């Protein structure tokens, strides 16, 4: 997508995403260069840092990450909503009791949405977090889980 009228110049910073200190350092390094827009990801815990530093300084931020819960300015996002499609799929399949193995690394918005619509539609959700299990003993915990 190179054009003829101008030329982009991306300043690539390969830092961490969970540690908000490195995110703040990379943001201030990009801001000291005087940029007009910032493309990047954000973690589930560091969403507030991105929304704060991009709404206060009025600098646009384009992301492919998960949709937020609320209307934050200067946050352009690429991933659409997943909760409405999933509720439409369950209502097409006409379920009443099911299990929901979720991960706690992209927020808990989908869990709250499916619990609210399940209680509004009188369903039985067995919702279990799986993200708190380490990589060292993830065989007997999964066996006890499916037991």
């Amino acid at each position: 997508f190179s054009t003829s009228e101008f030329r982009l110049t991306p300043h690539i910073d390969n830092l961490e995403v969970a540690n908000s200190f490195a995110v703040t350092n990379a943001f201030c390094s990009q801001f000291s260069r005087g940029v007009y827009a910032i493309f990047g990801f954000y973690d589930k815990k560091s969403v507030n840092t991105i929304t704060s530093f991009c709404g206060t300084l009025h600098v646009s931020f384009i992301t492919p990450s998960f949709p937020t819960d609320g209307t934050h300015p200067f946050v352009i996002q690429m991933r659409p909503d997943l909760k409405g499609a999933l509720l439409s799929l369950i209502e097409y399949y006409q379920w009443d009791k099911f299990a929901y193995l979720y991960d706690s690394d992209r927020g808990l918005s989908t869990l709250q949405a499916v619990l609210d619509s399940a209680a509004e539609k009188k369903w039985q959700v067995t919702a279990i977090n799986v993200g708190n299990i380490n990589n060292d003993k993830k065989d007997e915990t999964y066996r006890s889980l499916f037991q």
Binding site: T3, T24, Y36, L57, H58, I62, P64, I76
Partner: protein, 49 residues
Amino acid sequence: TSALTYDAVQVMTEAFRNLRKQRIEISRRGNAGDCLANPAVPWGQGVEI
């Protein structure tokens, strides 16, 4: 995520081409200042962006 990145590059290119086609000059240099300015006054031409 890679496909959404490939689409977001197209979105940014189309938006910057719309700025280049609307004759809006927002060109500046690398003197945006400190990120911890107190009070950090905004610059209005980002509001159009």
